[PDB]
Amino acid sequence: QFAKPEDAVKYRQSALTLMASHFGRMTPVVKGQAPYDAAQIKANVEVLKTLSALPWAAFGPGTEGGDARPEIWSDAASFKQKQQAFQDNIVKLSAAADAGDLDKLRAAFGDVGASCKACHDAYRKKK
Amino acid sequence: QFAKPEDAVKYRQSALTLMASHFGRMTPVVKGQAPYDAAQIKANVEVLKTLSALPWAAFGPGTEGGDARPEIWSDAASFKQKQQAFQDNIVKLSAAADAGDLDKLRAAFGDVGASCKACHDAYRKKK
Ligand code: HEC
Numbered sequence: 364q365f366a367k368p369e370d371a372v373k374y375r376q377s378a379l380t381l382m383a384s385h386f387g388r389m390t391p392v393v394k395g396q397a398p399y400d401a402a403q404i405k406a407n408v409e410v411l412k413t414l415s416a417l418p419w420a421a422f423g424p425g426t427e428g429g430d431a432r433p434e435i436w437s438d439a440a441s442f443k444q445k446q447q448a449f450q451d452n453i454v455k456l457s458a459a460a461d462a463g464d465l466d467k468l469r470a471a472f473g474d475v476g477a478s479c480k481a482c483h484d485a486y487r488k489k490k
Numbered sequence: 491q492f493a494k495p496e497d498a499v500k501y502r503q504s505a506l507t508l509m510a511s512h513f514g515r516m517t518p519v520v521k522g523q524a525p526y527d528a529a530q531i532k533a534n535v536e537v538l539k540t541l542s543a544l545p546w547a548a549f550g551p552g553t554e555g556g557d558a559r560p561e562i563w564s565d566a567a568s569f570k571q572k573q574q575a576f577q578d579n580i581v582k583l584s585a586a587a588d589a590g591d592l593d594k595l596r597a598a599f600g601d602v603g604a605s606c607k608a609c610h611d612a613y614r615k616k617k
């Protein structure tokens with residue numbers, strides 16, 4: 364869906380920015396600094412589920428650019444494993460949110476965040 | 491969910507960029523220049539449905555910035571009507587996509603695009 368590589372870059376950056384807002388806005392809830400409304404979090408995690416599937420199709424071959432390491436492209440199976448571990452962690456977060464369980468939510472949230480960081484450290488250029 | 495107004499601006503710009511990609515990527519299909527796969531379009535419109543609900547909460551009071559006209563804020567009921575007409579046009583597009591009907595899809599797509607343009611012309615600063 365991208366006319367030029369720059370368009371894929373802009374899409375994935377926007378997707379990741381959203382995904383990041385929908386993940387990070389739950390930090391006060393997971394920490395107890397904001398109240399836990401199970402329905403609110405269920406709905407937000409559904410949004411996050413949708414968003415978390417979107418970035419990956421915008422790293423199609425030859426779309427080097429942005430802060431993406433070339434290592435994404437030449438190690439496709441392995442990048443795919445990082446992506447797929449992250450979404451299976453998102454599945455677990457959805458299960459916790461759907462269950463309405465703050466303890467399970469906190470644990471699952473931590474696992475997701477670790478998976479964000481794992482891909483970051485391997486595949487996101489240093490600033 | 492935004493620490494500063496700039497964060498709301500960046501969120502809504504990213505949301506709108508996505509929404510725009512998920513809408514615009516269907517143009518070749520609606521024009522017949524690309525094949526029509528009813529399941530593909532159903533799935534894409536579902537993504538668009540999710541995305542099309544997201545920008546509006548990131549124009550919360552005092553979040554003037556970006557290309558948003560101040561007119562969004564002082565005319566809240568009316569901006570809300572433009573937003574709500576646009577999503578009711580998205581509901582119609584979902585119905586067309588779920589029906590698997592290229593004629594209904596084309597008509598509904600045109601209506602959505604008109605609603606994008608209506609809000610654009612009223613509420614998006616001139617470049
Ligand atoms: C888990 C919920 C997260 C969160 C919070 C973020 N990511 Fe990543 N990310 C990855 C790569 C390769 C990039 C660079 C993309 C490019 O510039 O071409 C990024 C970038 C980001 C950003 C910045 C986006 C921007 O506006 O420029 C942010 C805020 C971000 N990420 C947050 C790679 C991955 C992954 C590889 C499989 C995974 C998993 C994640 N990111 C997960 C997350």
Ligand code: HEC
Nearest residue numbers: 503506507510513555556557558572573576606609613614
């Ligand atoms: C219907 C599917 C669309 C499409 C394709 C786009 N919009 Fe809009 N839009 C609105 C406002 C106020 C802005 C400015 C936001 C800001 O800068 O603070 C925008 C911006 C955009 C963009 C640019 C985003 C960016 O990356 O900077 C794009 C690509 C875009 N729009 C496409 C306002 C509205 C509406 C008011 C109710 C509606 C409806 C739409 N936009 C619909 C669409």
